[PDB]
Design a protein around this ligand. Sequence first.
Ligand SMILES: O=c1ccn([C@H]2C[C@H](O)[C@@H](COP(=O)(O)OP(=O)(O)O)O2)c(=O)[nH]1
Lengths: 229, 239
Amino acid sequence: VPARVLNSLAHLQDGLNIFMDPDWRQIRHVDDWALAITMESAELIDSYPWKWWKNVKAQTDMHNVRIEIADILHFSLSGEIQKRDDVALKSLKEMGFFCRPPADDELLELMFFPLTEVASAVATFRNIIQLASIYRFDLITKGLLLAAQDLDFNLVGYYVAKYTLNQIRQLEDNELLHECVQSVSVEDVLNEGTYLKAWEKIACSVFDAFGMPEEERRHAYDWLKSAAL
Amino acid sequence: PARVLNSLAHLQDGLNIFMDPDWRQIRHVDDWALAITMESAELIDSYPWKWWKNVKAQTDMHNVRIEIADILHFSLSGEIQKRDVALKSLKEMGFFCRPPDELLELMFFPLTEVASAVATFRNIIQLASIYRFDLITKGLLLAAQDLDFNLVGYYVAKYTLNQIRQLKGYKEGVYVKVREGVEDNELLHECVQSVSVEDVLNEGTYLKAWEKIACSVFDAFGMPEEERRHAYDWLKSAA
Ligand SMILES: O=c1ccn([C@H]2C[C@H](O)[C@@H](COP(=O)(O)OP(=O)(O)O)O2)c(=O)[nH]1
């Protein structure tokens, strides 16, 4: 996943954040993001049957898991931006604090697959809670993208689709969104070079799909275009 | 107090044995770290922490009590299973947090405002992460005296509800939890408030007053005498 792409993603988030409160980056604090990443991580974990003593038989909600990975991605990028000392990660590692199932370089040994299995997920997403602990949003974004790759979940497709809907809502939905992501590939939306062509294809599939008359779009694609930096 | 605190950890042992007898063997220190992480998030969600939402509704403080009793259950558990400069270097790091002794440097009061609650239990999670259940327990008691509530009492009440639940299909997904509006735990208030704080902490009395609470909760759930035997027997042995 090319850095260029990672940067672009954050731009869009900044757009999203701006609409809700245009002074987010002054008012808002690095510690809020870390909080929100901690809660939605918990939220994700609660979709799995981790409680040894409660409905032990419960089937996992891998759908909700996917939509939670994205919910977290929003807060992560928001903290990434906002964060604009290092040997503090490896320090926690030797302290053996980060954890593992009882059975980028630097962040792979904290992720545990397949995410479809409970212990592997619990491990993984507690380790996001910890990366957050110490404000490492950048690795939580890279981690979230891994989670999704393991889950065969086209996360940045879905993030752009969902971004473009928010655009409409200023000027079952989920089912339509996932359908727009299809018109465009996984390899495509990440491939440095073609990616901004491909994100524009998704955007445009959303607008059509929802019914943004061609005529009200004169500026819809603007920030998206500016997201190339 | 002191034998009371021992007496608490013994009950915790019996509750966990009720769930799986070979628990110390099948459980793992990280199971308890997780457990505390989640009941800490469920406590924090109580509070209007979403800057992007309605802050106006009142924080349900009575609910907080019960989620504090629940964390306590988990740290007693943690402490039991687990058989300095680590911590102060983490403090240096920036690994703990603040709103905008080694223990009362990560608790922030009053627990009544969103912000101080958020730092406090964010740091309770951070603690559970390095498996310092010892400091969690103690912060929980510290927290009970800021909220001016009867932790030991609530612990015993929830302890006994935790049993009722298992006997009523909880592990199997078939328990009646909410009944016309009202959830499980809400029942636990009038129960513990039936006895005094003084009473639950006296080094002679106390086990009598805990047996009182136990019994109140069982009466709420209308239970036969035979199903109260695991709890009444662990409350005896607790001496
Ligand atoms: O091995 C265990 C597992 C759970 N609990 C107790 C602790 C706490 O009091 C409660 C948490 O259970 P819950 O299902 O999360 O209930 P609630 O929704 O009321 O918070 O269960 C134990 O004591 N021992």
